[model samples]
Target: GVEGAAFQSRLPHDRMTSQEAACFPDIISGPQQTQKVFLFIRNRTLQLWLDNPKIQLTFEATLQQLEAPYNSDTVLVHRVHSYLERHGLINFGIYKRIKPLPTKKTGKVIIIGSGVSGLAAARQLQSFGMDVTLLEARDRVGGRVATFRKGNYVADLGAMVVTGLGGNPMAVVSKQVNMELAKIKQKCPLYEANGQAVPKEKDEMVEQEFNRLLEATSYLSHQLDFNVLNNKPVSLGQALEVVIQLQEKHVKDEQIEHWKKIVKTQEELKELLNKMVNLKEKIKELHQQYKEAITAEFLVKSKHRDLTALCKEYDELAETQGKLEEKLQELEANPPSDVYLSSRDRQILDWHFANLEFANATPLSTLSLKHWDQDDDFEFTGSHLTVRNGYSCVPVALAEGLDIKLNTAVRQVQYTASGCEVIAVNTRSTSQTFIYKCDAVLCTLPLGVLKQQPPAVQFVPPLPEWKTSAVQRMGFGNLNKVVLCFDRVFWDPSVNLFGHVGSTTASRGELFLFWNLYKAPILLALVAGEAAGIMENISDDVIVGRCLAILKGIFGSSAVPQPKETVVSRWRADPWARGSYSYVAAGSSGNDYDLMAQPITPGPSQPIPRLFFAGEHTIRNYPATVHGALLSGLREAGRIADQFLGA
Candidate 1:
């Protein structure tokens, strides 16, 4: 009777051929004429109930329950109650057999923070005829959705990918602004330390193994009772450790045996490399035979061009170029980076874990094994894409036609009889204290900021135990980006991303993934989890140098070029955003996110909910996503409308 498995087994109503006689037993004694009138009224009510059927049986059950005491009609009421199981309608709100709102009302709403959430909420509240104004601590909008640009090249520092497009509002809004979206090519090549991609068959085989491992873990956690005794929440790392050991031991022996086969292939590959040097002459002789004929071509056909047509030595030198395409079948298969400690399979797997950590923004040790994927189904479906020009266009477009004050940091908020009062220090010119009064306030501050409530926004009464506990319980993690703008593209241009398999546990997250941007010859090396946690205090040059070393290690010194410019994201060190985004930590569950979203009423015992909250952190199912933030903002605005207008 769960996950929508409920059922019912009764007809909707109890109609009969002997109805007037049936009603005689239930009829009450009154004046003869009034008794007839009462019968008519009851008949009319039953007619009205039968006239218009309801999708939800709740109201019908409630009506039957009410009439039971008057008519001794207890069995039918029970019938309606049992039949409710068949409908399976979602419960909306509190039992409100009350009247709807009569008159719509409007009032001022003060939105704090100029992030996408705050901007969206303000825009929505404004549309509802509320006097909405946004206050920003910084001079710019887009708290985490930031875009950096140097001349023509654009780099989105935060919130780069529209992870999925179908049902994602950002896609709709981006199209509305006529912002060009570049669908990121889905090729992610996992490279060995030797700078070559793994064999496609082997890479895909390991990927399926990883997915199968995860599927089994989810089964043990959900279908079977994993925590049958301990009551302790298992981390994702712990689950994987046990799952991989059991499921992969057979694969382990199989991998070692397969590599032995690849080892034989490796010898042939070495022979190919050595033979390639000698085979150059044979390819060069064959090139003149083919070059004399044609190619994607029109040189021998006499349609267009060939370099150095008149020179004889230049022709031989041009023929020698064909040697580069040799050994297509006999290229190296597996790198020997971790062959000293373990099979190369684990290195490929570690790179996979690094990518998972980047997506989670939390270390594997802290991630919840049970609830980590609670919101995955809600993710919009389609190719992941990014704004072509810049994400700045998004915040700029969203912030339009709205009154937002820059450099006005909210210090405190008070909701008295005078209405919600926001006190801020405007540091634009002088240290001026400005107090704003609004009927409602929507606080879209980041979760990290809420955790420390730092001389960082305060409330009249401190936030309630429920709200603050949720803030502390929810995990706000960091994943920094090291943007390296190279002199030229020194990577395979066909792939969207590349991997750097680490040889040690500490280096696992260090330069684990590099994303190539189309606007410029740049590679964003993402340092995730604890590795990113270490880069905040280190010198920028040192971090960049370390990243370059990883590239040089993989592609060799000559193949890897130096970067012309570098930028790193230190979200952990930022004053506004104390960390990157939110995640469900091991001890925490999805309940914490919902708890944070619940509205407050001056630290009341229960819900009167004058002040509202909205952010990625505040949303239950969707967290650490652009769509979550945007949707949360929209949700809070509607909450404000319901509170103010009673509609």
Candidate 2:
């Protein structure tokens, strides 16, 4: 009813009353059209509430009236409240409001790297009224967040999954761009050496045994009390040997339960053999009947056709019977080689060890058991969310409206009492050199780049001993991916992940895990650690051949079509990013991250620190994560604000 009157142009001047002139609809309205009236009121009221907080009480009264007549629309009302809470329109006492920082202008800051952390730092610093410039070595942004787009389909070559979504800043920021996150289900199917799928029961049994082995190793390392000997760092492999000894001792002491389980398994094997024998006898009868019918001269055409079908069925059954007999014989002959482990158990353990190697991107012998799980504090969410648009979108969004110089690789950095100067070379031109002088510099270079032999960025006065030691102590890991797009998806799309068992444990990480991109004609083969390092030296054709061979082995056929396109990432070979990410190595602790993050200043006479450090490697709890990089950038920005902005 108020629609025509609400617009001034349509209404006569004399008919324009204050009630009609009001932007929002009347608070109290008839029930028939109250929902429609409330819709207009909510929008106007939200604008008013955000613009002027003093009128929030009036908006609250209208909101209560808007919900009073609709009991079924509680969800709608709750959403409105959530929106209000998020925008800091009202203090609903539910969610904390993001308070705006004090607007004291800061000096110029140079951010090295256009990765997520660098972009995040630059954005935060710019928000505090600082001139921020981002320099990237690569031609484009998003360093390890590369996405390859083909036709309508896109595949992530680096940083695919966004882990720890609950309290993760990357997840929170991703929602702003309306990025779709596909939840990754944690179901990994295992395969045998001959490409047969491992039964779910057997898979679970193997996993449990491997978990027990890890648990025993961890417990024994602490329980054995190695204080009598000199306190020295021990490798996980060494600890595992002690766990084996402990297990053997336990089996010797309590053999009853162990023997009972073995006997039960043996009984099940015998039962399986009995079934196979009965099936073999039936197949033999079918074969004899087929032979007799074929030999009969007066056999009818239909009878001859049926006898041929019977022979085919007999042959298939005979094959299964032979495999069963082989398995029975293997069990009977082998028995239990060790008191603690049978031959089959040993095989399962080996598969599990290989799986761990693939998961950790390093061999068990090299992985530090003490610091393996040190990052538990940062892992707040279980579900891994893969972004459909790309992981680069997050950094691109963060870097909106910020000055970014791509393909400008920093060759040297010099800091003095006045300011810090960075010398960079244009990768495209190669002949041109550019120098950028700023009040302070924030370096978000990866650990691999920092540890380069010749040094990626030469420091004028040289980094102090502590910084060099921290860089040396930290470890960079290698994890590469090879993506193959076929003409058509020949593999099962339902299977999210499957692994192939290698002939030897040393070959385990070579194209171990295959990730089937659902609804797309793409399959990704992941290789890590020493295998990834080796792959960098091999030709692309050889790498593709190896991956193809693994797929053929898993599907048990060479009929799989050649790939239409191939994309591979050799992070180890890349000079900009020598390795994938950082991890805590043996004899290293979180203190190293703290040391790496420490800012470098020429002297106290200088107003602000000349140089600062931030990256995934510098973060304490969330190392090697995108969120960690983003947060570290913000951390450095906050430090600058505190030092110069007086906030």
Candidate 3:
């Protein structure tokens, strides 16, 4: 169709008229050609939409309006929303639009430590529109809670198993962040006495028995009602005798189910012990035979005739063999002697005994202690609730905008009438000095650090006698970690061989502090308290060699292959951190945490806050977890925010 001259005359801007469009030629359009047209149309439409302010406003308005309707029904919203609504978003405009009130802006809050607690505190403070700064002594963040990458697999070096998440602050935060959590199935290694792998025996049988024993003991304790008598420690022997009497009474009353289970568990444990004794006897016999063979070989090889001396040596060896044989015969003849051997081999025996005491002679029941929940099958959960990058993400995030001065050690905090000033020295270079003036100071430094560099800060007057005593009263324990990275995973993929080797029970830090055994090309070795302190001064090679030998004895020779690289964190030696984490020593005064958490004020009156404390150690219950540290930071941040907002 052609309109021609009429269409041209009618065309706008001296162009072809609308009728001229009817004369357009029809051309074959390929998919590619059509796609290009479609793309162009989309681009033009987008440009137009962007240009229209009304449209942009409408889109945002619609999203805001629909947010309530779109909310998930199943989700339990965090209480943080109330605080957020009150405070308003610090970094985002839309959040401001949603809640127009200006958030309470606290003066700059400085957080030291970039672990979980620091991160959570920073995030919370930031959300509240408060200026926050996190300073970390370490170059890389995530103090302690680390995922050691050993080639393809990752081994958690600290806090491997996440527990007490029902009301855990970190767990709540993790859900808010939309973190994908993997629920680790609780399983352990299946050991075979004869070197053949086999299915584990049912733990329920042992568990039931242990519970009965516990109840029997509890009944006896209730009868005594120590609270009514007096709060005092009772001897283990007395407690055992009392519990036995209660058990006997309960059995007479036909309440045998409760007592019977405990008895059976003890019998089973004793049986297991007897089997171990038999194995030991066999091993000892073999050792004796080997020794005799060696002596005979030596005598035969000798050229000199010391026949009299040789005979005497032979007699001594025979006597030792006869004693061992007699012991073995006694054990076999009896119903498997329930004798337990104690070895002072690096406190290994003590470690096992502590765990046994905690577990009541069976490992099954201690799987869920305190708030740790056990499923119907009595399986404890091993779900790891943490950031994918690492728990250190919290501290790193906290330190994001804060001014950090590393390699600098605060020498003293001097109190003035107005406030406090901190004198610090940078030890890395020449003694470069720094002085920070502030209203109040929170010292989050480790106990060891404090011990090394006593408060150099001048007290305008002198600190109270109580403060000095409190500082001395605080108990600190040292801990060490050794990391070994291998070229590849040496363990079988199907086998779950993560557990403590030297100690059956985990307690008495120096005896056995290693926890969370998982396979990684990298293995982490831990020693706590005095042992950890000792490890700090030793060479890396020696540490590696010792760890390797320990692993070899536990996992057999296969686990002793040369590691590609070894790294160690001698926390006891680190001046900044001092130790991996803090622990209370025996006979510590009650409520030491209060002393540790007390804010060190500079003077009678001051304008701004200076010193602050944060770390797992600062928080009770969450003493060793990332969330605790974060909560501590937030708690301090809130205190600081109040001061600033008031100003």
Candidate 4:
């Protein structure tokens, strides 16, 4: 018999017919009864073996090693045990069966806010086998991020720019959610002060002229590079001397005003003085030409063969004119108040005076500034893309799988020896009050909401002095977004973007920056910080009329287009959000971040951790970013998880 057994095992192949395979597992397009039966039989066998009196000690030891209870509600725990066995963690062979011990039942975790950070913490904690419940005072989950939508287009009402997102968590989430980032368009159309359309062709010349004038002007005022120079205001005499010397060296390459220094004889000095006077007349003519070149009329009318040719002409005139005007002004004010003004003893004085005249009076022709226009500097990238579906993506993502208790207003946090307790009221009924018991409680309240605390909602023991000070010190900027939509692309159907065609003084580059994008058929304007608070008290109709007036400044009578749809989000007045993001005030430093991040727990070894803080404010590395808030929540969750491990 043994010889026969060895012969069967040594056979080349052991083949199974379809009938035989079916008999074993019933592989077919039907319900998986066999797999279910096998699981039941295996679990039954494991329970019977574990209960065996002979191996009670062995089974008990095994349960301790698994870090689980004797019984679990999930059948997958056994599957996990099987996986561990397959990976060779136990000495048991493939045939040796085992079941997973039940894990410790970590009670429910309550998160206090529904912002992006709170959502991230909830998701992370749920993944680590902890039950989480989120509470939000607002009706929706997304705290500050809200997008206004029409039919297909989306407009962002809060959080305008997402900068430095290369390796950011927000970037990662944005990609996972399939947010396609559109780059800013660089081809900004140039416009004139009178609202007439100007091509960006003269951009280079304008930029060059601007830079030259600014630099030449800076020589008279030390404020450009040194603070000491700004201590004393620049005098017209000092302004002129710098300009004149620059012009004489750059234009004529000869000293004209040094006549007073070279001639010891009064007759010689008088003759030299006359020659200098004649040169001043010539310089003044050049100065007039330079002024004509930079005027709004000349810029609009000039259609030169090359932008550089015009720029060069303007540069020469601008450089010489600015300097000569300064020199002439200085001569009038301090005209050789002493001949030593041109003397070697006063060489520094003469040199500075001459330089000012040259710098100021040098004609536009003398300007070496190139032809880049302001459009190059202020190009607007494509910013807003319609959240094709809805702005609720953030709320939905944060709310997913979280046990959220809606309409809960947190009144105050109290510290106890066991842990921290959140004293809150159910907003559904006026008289309902509840104590949310937890080891630790994380607060993600907005800075504005914190700043505008109602008298009714008070902390039990009250917040620390530093915490109160930090909240008071932070500045919350008001950002208001006004959306104007038309029935169709009326003004420029073919043009995707248009600006500078508006009615108000701001439209004439006075009131504010605005844009008309054809893709969304939306003309939008953003008034931020100080500007936003100023306009918040105005009525919506008045604001809309003001926007129309701005458009009229550029488009003349055609500027006023009645928007079919209008929407505005006044973030400054939002009760829950107060304002958008927290900005560091004038006196605040990075160390203030530590003060804001302090936990409210009474001690390290308390039964339950309590009174935690997490949000953009709690994060030092990434304050004022959604990623910071998210990561900060995760960090707090990790701390809670670590406490469980220690216990």
If scored against the real structure, what TM-score would every candidate get?
0.68, 0.70, 0.56, 0.55
lDDT digits (tens) for residues 523-605 of candidate 1: 88888867878878789899998888878866778877777778989998887888899999877889998888888776433
lDDT by residue for model 3 over 234-286, one digit each (tens)? 33324434554664565455544434544655565566566555655655554
Q: Which ten residues in a row have the lowest lDDT in candidate 4?
A: 87-96
Error of 3 at 595 (Å): 4.0
Clashing pairs for predicted structure model 2, backbone only: none
lDDT of 2: 0.70
Candidate 4 lDDT, 23-104, residue by residue in tens = 3443333346544433333333333333331222233343443323333424434543432222112211111114432265
lDDT of 2 by residue, 1-647 (tens): 22321221112222323433342233233343654544444343443333333322332343555534543455545544443333223321111224443466558888899988898777767755788898998988989888988876578887888774654545446556567887766777877666667778777876887898888766755666431224656666667667777777877756565566556666765776676577667656655765665636555555666656766765665676577566656555755524676544555566667666655656666655576667874565448778877777776666667799999999999987688899999999989999999888899998999999788899886889999998987778888888888888777667778876655556657776788743578788888546878878888888998888777876656558888888888888898899888877766778899998999887545254779999989989888878778778877877775566652
- In model 1, the worst 10-residue window by lDDT is 1-10
TM-score, cand. 1 vs. native: 0.68
Residue 158 displacement (Å), model 2: 1.2
**Candidate order (TM-score):** 2, 1, 3, 4
Stretches of model 3 off by over 4 angstroms after superposition: 1-136, 144-161, 172-185, 190-389, 415-419, 451-468, 494-519, 528-530, 554-560, 588-590, 600-612
The lDDT of each candidate is 0.69, 0.70, 0.45, 0.52
